[PDB]
Amino acid sequence: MKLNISYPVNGSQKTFEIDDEHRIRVFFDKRIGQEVDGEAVGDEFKGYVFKISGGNDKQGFPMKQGVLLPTRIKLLLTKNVSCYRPRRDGERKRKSVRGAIVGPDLAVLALVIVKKGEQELEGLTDTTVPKRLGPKRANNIRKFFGLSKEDDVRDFVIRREVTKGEKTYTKAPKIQRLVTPQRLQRKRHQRALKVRNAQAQREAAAEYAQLLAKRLSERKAEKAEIR
Amino acid sequence: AKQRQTTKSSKRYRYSSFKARIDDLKIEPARNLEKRVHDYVESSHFLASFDQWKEINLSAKFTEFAAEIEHDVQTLPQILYHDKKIFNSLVSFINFHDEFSLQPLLDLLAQFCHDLGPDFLKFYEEAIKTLINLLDAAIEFESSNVFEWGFNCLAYIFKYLSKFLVKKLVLTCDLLIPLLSHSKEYLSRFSAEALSFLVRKCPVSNLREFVRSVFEKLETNLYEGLLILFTESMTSTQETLHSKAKAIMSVLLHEALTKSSPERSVSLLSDIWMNISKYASIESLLPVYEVMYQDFNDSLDATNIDRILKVLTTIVFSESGRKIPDWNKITILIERIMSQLSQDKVAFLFALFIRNSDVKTLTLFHQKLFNYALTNISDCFLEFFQFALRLSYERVFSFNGLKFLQLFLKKNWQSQGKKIALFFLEVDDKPELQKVREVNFPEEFILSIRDFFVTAEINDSNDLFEIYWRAIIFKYSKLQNTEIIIPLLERIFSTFASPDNFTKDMVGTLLKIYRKNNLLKTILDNYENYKESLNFLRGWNKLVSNLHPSESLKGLMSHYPSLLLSLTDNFMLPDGKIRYETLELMKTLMILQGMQVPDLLSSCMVIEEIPLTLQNARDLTIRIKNVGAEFGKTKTDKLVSSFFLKYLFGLLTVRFSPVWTGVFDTLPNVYTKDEALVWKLVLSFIKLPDENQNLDYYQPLLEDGANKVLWDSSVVRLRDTIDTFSHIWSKYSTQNTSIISTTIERRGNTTYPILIRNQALKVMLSIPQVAENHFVDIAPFVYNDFKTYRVITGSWTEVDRNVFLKTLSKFKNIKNVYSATELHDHLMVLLGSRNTDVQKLALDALLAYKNPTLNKYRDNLKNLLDDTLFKDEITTFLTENGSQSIKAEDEKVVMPYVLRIFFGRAQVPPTSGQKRSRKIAVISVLPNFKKPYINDFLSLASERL
């Protein structure tokens, strides 16, 4: 079966087709999350460690973690689970999924290189893929560049160059959770509103108390007159 | 905001800010070609609009105005006879400042002037005052449409009374000074346009009187308002100028060049010229350009020599050289200005000419151009030259500035030798200025300075400064510099065994003077105190690279076997450049030794070279992980091990998160090579933030050299280039401060980042066993409570503390550490901390001690820490006679823990309803405890007091 091997430290990934069945047998009986030695797979992978991440069968159905079987089964999948993207809120669908036990009928098996062996794979270890996007939140920028609190993230924003025909310019992200005078103004405005509301309520309460006291005194005077 | 609504959305209705409407609004009624009601008339303009406005506007205020005036406006003779009451009502109603009636009133006020204009003159002053108050009122209630009505009303009156106002403009301007001088920019901008329309309609004779008055006023926002006024009068349509522009522009120039007119007026003229130059195309400027040349030629004189040059500087700069038709004319002026001043202004002028001149004209005049500079700018030719280089260095080199610089140096080396040193210092780093460094230097100066070292007194920092600025110039000297240097270096080394920062840089300068063995011996004798300095490290790098390996060398370095290991200590420094140069030095020394350079050395050099970017972020990590693997698999000697381990900790100083990833992965698997070496490196980093590092550098005697180099320009573009030129002048004005200030900039970085302690702690966390064995060195911080120190100078951050406590829990045998008991008591203090996270770390380390009784009740204590399960545990775990209660035999060990954990929970701010019940529960469990334990709990509360 095809092996889709991914090296996350480079971010690289490549497919290797397999014909001999010795390596395929040593993959058998394993489970997602378990580790296997690359030397058993072949000399090219000697010294490597592969963690199984999943796979697809000859019918295209995916492998699901948490179900310990060697055969497909129809599972009721819901929000925030693998192998299912709900079209509508609260929608739950029963779909056929392949078990978590490796077997002879896996069309492709996905592997993650936990540890590098002595020899360097041509397509995985020798090459690197850059990160697509840099940090956006201010604290993330500080963490990425290890900035001090005093140092302003404004000067450390990553810029990417875009060239259109003869023209050229740069694009950079909008920082979020940045301390700006507008935020201070909003905070101050909320605090002032709160205090003013409290004072107005107290004033209204005092006025009502005075009115009630005056009415009470008048009624008591009338009662005294009746006596 | 900059990116205006340039790309328009498909929406039919869209919000527009009040500022946005004000920005696009423009006061110019003539452009509007829409049919106007008053254009068709039967009796008078006032009646025609009046009937229309009765129909459209239904506002209450306008309705009352209509009723009061309806009878008196039926016929034009009626209007003229009753004009006094008509004007009063219009002004009376406008005063209320009601928006819903303002539009008909402002229109009718204009049409009222149209019907009886010459008669309006007696009303003219009252009208403008009414409008000024209305516009001033309009600022409070933001309504762009109101401003459109008011200013158009002003424009219409200004249109109808054109002949009579034009005769007395300075009076009319006087009324509008508060508007033109107003703080808000847009009010001044609008009033400038309305007033501008009269300016275009002037007789030239009347204009000169008007131009004189405003310039007299010119000597808040008046400058800006006038600038908008004149430029508006010049511009009529895009890429074109009004026909009268030449007449007005001549009048402004003649007044500006006049001695009586203030200098700021010439500055205004400069700003006016640039606005029109940017606005207008080439052809429209040709009539304007011609008048400028002729007027300058006709009025050239000593008194106005400075003013003329100031305007010419603007012309050459304005939109660079593309607006200029033919530079031969401007050149023909320049000798006339030269033949018949302010040196700094001249230097400003020629530099732009070099940058902006077409190739042909510059070639014809490049020789005469610089000869003028030697004539009068020789006092400041170098300030000109550096500015010329920055603007266009390639053009200066192409046009033979270098030989003229060489001629300059010969003429004035005696006068301003220090100032020459400043120039060659600043240009040193720039690779494009390599040709300047190639310029041969006058020989006589070299000998005079050469004689200085041969007999120089060097006993104090001031004398060193004398050597320093001189030392820079010898680098170009060709008269066997080596022989003079060696005695001087020995004098410097012996005189100052303990160098300060300035000294380390001079020797680097001195070593840099060398060009293609005894000197090498000299530096080796005294280098331990100079390895830190970058400049010394470069100068040494230059020396070793030049010199060819030989057997005699192998004897030399053999005399100092510790040379290689000593230099390795530079790799922990916070500067990338120092580490790179040290590596390059390391390789060269091995070549001289003949020893083979390890391949690890080459790999580390490559990593340092890679730029620190997101694109290369990943590539850096693998190189660290690869070489770390290379170091691990390959057995090496102490020097390689010392080299690599120190280099790794140097990477921790780097401010790049990907770099940290590789080293944090590499270091835990390679520390076995030298367990002692890593620990000292970790130990030192922990103590760096507490250690105080200050850069103390020699302060030269202060120079009080400063002056207003150029005039101030409102326009940003011209003002920036002025700021650049002034910055250069001030730098050269104070040569002593400038030389030192430039020097400190290029030394490098010596201040470790304050986060370095956290990085070292992460290394300590990854390897608890090494910390456990070397607890003797780390113990004192805990007993100080992680406080420098009774007032505290400083303390560790909460993050640093947390990583430390986690490491303690990871110790396999905490009980057998150097001081277990004193540690054991302090963790009890931390167990009393209010912060629950701290207690869990404190407890985990406490449980690291193998005590059976604690192990029996470990989970209950953990649940007590856990916020969710704190409440039920109190009832179950601590109730007297409880099934899960602590056994009497085991109480004595467990209760001290129980007392301390509860103490922190009592310190929770008793602030929210859940948090308040928590405090009540803590105090409510006291009766369960035996009285001696209750006494202990009370004792803890009073301990802090």
Place this chain on the structure above:
Amino acid sequence: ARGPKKHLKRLAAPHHWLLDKLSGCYAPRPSAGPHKLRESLPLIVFLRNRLKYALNGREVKAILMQRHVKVDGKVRTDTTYPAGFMDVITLDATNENFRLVYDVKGRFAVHRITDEEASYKLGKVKKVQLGKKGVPYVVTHDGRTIRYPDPNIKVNDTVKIDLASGKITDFIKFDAGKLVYVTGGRNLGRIGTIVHKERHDGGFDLVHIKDSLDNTFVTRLNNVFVIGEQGKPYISLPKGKGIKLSIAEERDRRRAQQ
């Protein structure tokens, strides 16, 4: 149905809106608001079918989004905002102020008012109750909650609310001899004086009302709204002064004026 309805057929719409039965299939459903559905006049019907300012719904939306219409001194932008009894509609651009009052026929009538009379409204006190923290408050017929009322104010009284501050300026007790306005039933729109209140515990109270023409009628208490003392209304009344006229007399008057 499985939830709240959002459509209103024209035939099912309130009669007093006077909607053409063949213009379309649907009618404006008043959104939730101060007044009940059947006793409210949405702004669309008021601006289009009564004032004739707008020719169709889209122009009404154009008017509202311009923020020219104010209800009770506050700008509204919902086309189906349920304006109702005693609500002040201000159109500043036209310099017009309207108070929604039923005419004798039982329909909302376009009544123009002065600005001063537009400065306040009248509200029937539907509830008097202590809120949280022991603060008395009154709920009126239009859903306004006003805190710290005058203690003498009781249910079924009338309170004169100043729109600017939303506070009670004065109040009228529900007593015999007071001038009242009918706001429900077949007697809708009539004006009279109270004569006597019949009380029936656990049932609907009845009120006898005598008109200026000495005709008398009985109405449920929920449909009565005190508007002032006899001859001294606190608001300007529409034409006809709430007097019901027989069909024959209406014919005579119509022929005479024509």
Place this chain on the structure above:
RNA sequence: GAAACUGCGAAUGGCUCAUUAAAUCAGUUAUCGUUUAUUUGAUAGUUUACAUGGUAUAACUGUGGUAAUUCUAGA
């Protein structure tokens, strides 16, 4: 301003009369027997801060399975 996340709607509208004989429905009552998005009006000094995390992912880059579907797996 595509895509995607987020919020809201999709329980309205339209169609049909199968079941349903104190059931539905009509008129008339009650919630002191209860929920109520939304609208409208009130209403909360008592709770590193110049402002916290991934305890995190989509869209996106890249590597793939199935004959096939508004299928989706690893990084």
Place this chain on the structure above:
RNA sequence: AUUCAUAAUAACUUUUCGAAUCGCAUGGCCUUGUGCUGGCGAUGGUUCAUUCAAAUUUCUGCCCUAUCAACUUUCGAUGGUAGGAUAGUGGCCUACCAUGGUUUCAACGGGUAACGGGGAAUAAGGGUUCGAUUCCGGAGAGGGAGCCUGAGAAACGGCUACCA
């Protein structure tokens, strides 16, 4: 009409809420600091009231059939008590109790080419028939059963089984 509104006392909570949100604009104080203070709006948020609603609910009113006279009660039928559940009352369900409930004033059972009403036709008046069908209310989405989401669904141009 209340154990109502509200308040207070003592505790309790895997326990909430009490603005880490956004647009436009740049006013006022000065000890001149990117110091302090400040406007017009949007969107969120506890509780109360109002509104659109929802649920249950009191009294009266339905065509033919007595050659359907007794029905309901074991497996809830009537009622009491306590609990569970419900948004909530309630045999709605559970446990223990009693033996009740309707009926010749027609219960129960059967038929219905039975959705109900506003209405339509005829008739001089009483009556007789029609009303799937422009509005109101109820139920359904091939037939049963069961649910996620959401304030609101036993939803079906949402999902799951079984039957066809």
